[PDB]
Amino acid sequence: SKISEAVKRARAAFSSGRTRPLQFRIQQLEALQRLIQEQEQELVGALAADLHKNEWNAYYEEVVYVLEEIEYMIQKLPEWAADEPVEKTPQTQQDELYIHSEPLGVVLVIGTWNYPFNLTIQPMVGAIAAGNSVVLKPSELSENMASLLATIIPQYLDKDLYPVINGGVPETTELLKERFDHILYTGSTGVGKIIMTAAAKHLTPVTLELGGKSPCYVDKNCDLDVACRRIAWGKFMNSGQTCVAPDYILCDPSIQNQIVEKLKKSLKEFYGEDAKKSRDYGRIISARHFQRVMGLIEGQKVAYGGTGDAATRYIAPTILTDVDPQSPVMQEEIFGPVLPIVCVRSLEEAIQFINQREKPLALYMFSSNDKVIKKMIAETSSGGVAANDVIVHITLHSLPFGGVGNSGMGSYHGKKSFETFSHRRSCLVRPLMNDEGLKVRYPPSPAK
Amino acid sequence: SKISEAVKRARAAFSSGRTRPLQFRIQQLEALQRLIQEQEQELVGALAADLHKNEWNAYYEEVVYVLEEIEYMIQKLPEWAADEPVEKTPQTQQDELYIHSEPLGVVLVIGTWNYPFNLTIQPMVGAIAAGNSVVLKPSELSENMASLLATIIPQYLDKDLYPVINGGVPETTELLKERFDHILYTGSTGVGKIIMTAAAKHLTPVTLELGGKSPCYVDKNCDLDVACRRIAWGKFMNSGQTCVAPDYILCDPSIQNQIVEKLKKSLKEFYGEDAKKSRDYGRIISARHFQRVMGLIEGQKVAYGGTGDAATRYIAPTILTDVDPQSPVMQEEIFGPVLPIVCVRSLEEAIQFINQREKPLALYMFSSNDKVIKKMIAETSSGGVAANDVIVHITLHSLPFGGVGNSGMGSYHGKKSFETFSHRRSCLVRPLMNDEGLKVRYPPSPA
Ligand SMILES: CCCCCCCC=O
Ligand SMILES: CCCCCCCC=O
Ligand SMILES: [K+]
Ligand SMILES: [K+]
Ligand SMILES: [K+]
Ligand SMILES: [K+]
């Protein structure tokens, strides 16, 4: 089959040794830089068609991080790839002890649809830097990016080592029967279990970047104006379709009304009075997801927004107050511009609220009290944490990005990408000469 | 069920916060130190009964590494557990960026039978240090150590947080239905896939320490007296039942008889003429494994040994010459005292031989030519590597221990154990101060 032949060619090309010299890897990374530069208008147009993005947020909210990653890993690749001496002991002082890094082989990257360029190419950048063949499976939901990547990737990258696999769920299922040396999947918690089950048949290690509801705790005593501007920004970028969007708000009921008003103000500054007329506001990816998200407003106390246009998959920025935690909008990852507010009476209540639910990909708190910050971190668990901002903690080269529990396992970005897509092999190299001090280990054992 | 309630109690204990203070973890680690000191005779007796170890190799080949790990982790725990600052950028100078380590929760350790104390308790030591509840499943095949641990662990450790689950395959299958936050399993490649499949049901991350055939390449021009004494030691310790034993030898045909003679010489020095009478020689763990290993001798050319005693599960130290790579002894992990020699005609042929097989837990090479060593490492892949020795590379605090491909995923030992049993959580803390340098990120976007 076409899928099986693609993987066969990728493994043969890996086995030829072509990816091992750093020179080759840097060239492929420089080819991706060229792709981003030459295909700028094509990439913008695909994101516009898929997600109603424009040239500005296509670059600053997605593509730029791929370029940043490429530039960083190119500059650091020789240091990362070098054998790494480690601490010795008195008994090993004449030996070499070091960590040897080597590629895993053929890596599979399964992209998702909400950031269809970054979440396909930024993982690939890492796997390329580590010397692997990298098979790509774009998500079919962002049809235009999927079609574009299938066209332009082979025009820049090695054709056998870095193939693009077209199709939807049936094709991914057949792809997942092939033998890979690592699989990185971004998407839903449920499908993560399916990926891990398929990987188990080959003992394939997996990096699973999954889902959840990223809580956003707002401290009574903080600067509600700057806090609410940042929350609005992170909740409503990409029309709410972000893996680390602040999903919902936990706040004292005594500030629910001020939070609603300052969110409204910031939203009006961002997108104007009618977000439907703003070039900076996105659309829902599909008819199914539009229907799903609209369903989450039914029966709720709408403080703002609450309408949607099925024809264009527009859902107006929506805020819900006094939300029952047991209601639909609080029982699934929203992934839409509907922001519920859940009332808690204390920090300790919020911690308990967070801890009773599955571990989220991100946890956010807004507060100028360091005791509040340290305590919420110490008593909770999440993939990552941001205090007094949203989104940004997953854009930093020094902060590995990934989940825990139902939000996923493993991480990548920056140096962690190189490690995740490598085997780190412990090496002990001794001189081959008689060592009187070793003789104590040989039998016979001392009889007394 | 007993198993359900045990894990229930362990998660309740963990969720109360009892393991979070470092002083509590150190108290538990100190209790393990006291266990090892106070239960020395009992541990030796169980290892003698299960595996025909003695007082000396019970300690120096198994238990000492657990003590070393405990002392090391106690010393380093505050530093390892500290929030770890990471590199900032021009845009994040006013921010805090750091890695926060936190326990995963309830960790399961499934032990195996060949080092039944070390491969249950040394993983546990790391998971305790990282602040987790640790459920233990000893291997049923090492019956005496399994029963001993079920008795003494709750006599020394917190009884809710660190339960011992009794039983065999059915009980392990039952246990694997429970929801854990990490599973470390040491055992066979095939069962590792079963573990990972069970883990996937709860999105449980796994550390799988599995199997394969660790090759031992012997270079034509090296000091064979030194090399063969080291190879003999690693191959025949624990009666060959070691995950990183040098499984088979690859060598030029011209040194095959020299290798045989020098192996024989070292074996007689170690164990005497009749290894059955040596206090230092082990026994096979079970009747099934005894019959399995004897079967691998069938049809082979025996240069030394080749006999066994079924009733006491003794297999004489055995060397096989001119082995066909397609024969049974070269088609499964031997895990016994049978050492096949496969002839190859160059280093390149050896590398190709190794690469056409599944990635081994360990790869060994003996050579006084650094270029030979570097080339074989460069062109192969294995969990770890030792050049000019065997075994020892998995005993060093600074060398993470684990496989790749069919020999497993993940690693532990020393600091790596603490990382493996933690969630490393990226943290960004910014001032909630208005920033004019951030406002460029907000809509409306420029033209
Ligand atoms: C900074 C690299 C990742 C940013 C793109 C969106 C991430 C969503 O999962
Ligand atoms: C501290 C070295 C590892 C423990 C010894 C046995 C390893 C597995 O057979
Ligand atoms: K390095
Ligand atoms: K000795
Ligand atoms: K033969
Ligand atoms: K602006």
Side-chain angles (χ1 to χ4, degrees), chain A residues 96 98 429, chain B residues 369-379:
Chain A
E96 275 190 276
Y98 63 92
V429 177
Chain B
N369 186 335
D370 186 71
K371 287 180 176 166
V372 166
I373 293 167
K374 297 319 177 189
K375 177 175 175 69
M376 180 165 273
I377 294 174
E379 297 186 14

Side-chain angles (χ1 to χ4, degrees), chain A residues 66-238:
Chain A
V66 181
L67 286 172
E68 282 173 14
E69 187 77 300
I70 292 172
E71 190 171 45
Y72 180 59
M73 305 202 322
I74 290 184
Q75 283 315 108
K76 299 284 282 187
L77 178 53
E79 300 163 61
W80 293 343
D83 289 338
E84 178 193 335
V86 304
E87 187 176 29
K88 301 189 185 173
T89 66
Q91 305 74 26
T92 52
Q93 200 59 44
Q94 305 319 317
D95 305 306
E96 275 190 276
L97 288 68
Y98 63 92
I99 312 294
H100 179 76
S101 288
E102 65 205 17
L104 295 164
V106 181
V107 171
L108 173 64
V109 173
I110 303 171
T112 188
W113 55 262
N114 57 318
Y115 290 81
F117 184 80
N118 178 282
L119 298 179
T120 57
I121 300 305
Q122 192 166 341
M124 184 193 207
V125 165
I128 294 174
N132 305 283
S133 154
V134 193
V135 177
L136 299 177
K137 182 70 203 89
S139 168
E140 68 172 347
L141 291 206
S142 41
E143 303 170 14
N144 295 286
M145 185 59 78
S147 180
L148 177 58
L149 294 182
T151 293
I152 63 172
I153 284 287
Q155 297 178 357
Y156 289 90
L157 293 181
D158 187 283
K159 288 182 180 154
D160 290 359
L161 286 159
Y162 314 112
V164 180
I165 307 287
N166 297 326
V169 172
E171 284 79 17
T172 304
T173 299
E174 293 310 282
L175 182 57
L176 281 173
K177 294 174 169 185
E178 301 291 327
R179 182 172 186 182
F180 297 100
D181 301 285
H182 193 104
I183 299 170
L184 185 155
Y185 166 82
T186 307
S188 71
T189 297
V191 168
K193 309 182 172 197
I194 296 179
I195 305 299
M196 195 178 164
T197 297
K201 299 183 186 173
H202 299 304
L203 291 166
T204 301
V206 298
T207 302
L208 305 178
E209 302 270 351
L210 309 181
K213 292 164 75 63
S214 297
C216 181
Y217 174 80
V218 182
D219 185 355
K220 258 171 23 173
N221 310 127
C222 80
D223 188 326
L224 288 181
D225 284 321
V226 198
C228 276
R229 179 193 287 113
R230 294 170 179 188
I231 297 180
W233 168 69
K235 173 65 175 177
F236 294 102
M237 81 160 52
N238 207 31

Side-chain angles (χ1 to χ4, degrees), chain B residues 34-82:
Chain B
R34 191 168 51 87
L35 180 158
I36 289 167
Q37 173 189 67
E38 301 188 350
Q39 303 289 326
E40 168 189 342
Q41 296 172 111
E42 290 81 357
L43 290 167
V44 172
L47 289 167
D50 288 336
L51 285 148
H52 201 260
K53 310 323 281 283
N54 60 42
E55 208 185 345
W56 185 94
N57 52 36
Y59 186 81
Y60 286 104
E61 291 182 2
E62 182 159 4
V63 169
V64 72
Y65 301 115
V66 178
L67 289 172
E68 291 182 355
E69 185 83 298
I70 292 175
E71 190 49 43
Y72 185 55
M73 297 213 175
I74 288 173
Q75 178 202 342
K76 293 290 182 165
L77 187 48
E79 163 193 340
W80 290 345

Side-chain angles (χ1 to χ4, degrees), chain B residues 77-91:
Chain B
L77 187 48
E79 163 193 340
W80 290 345
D83 283 346
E84 177 190 342
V86 303
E87 188 183 37
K88 301 181 175 191
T89 65
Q91 303 77 0

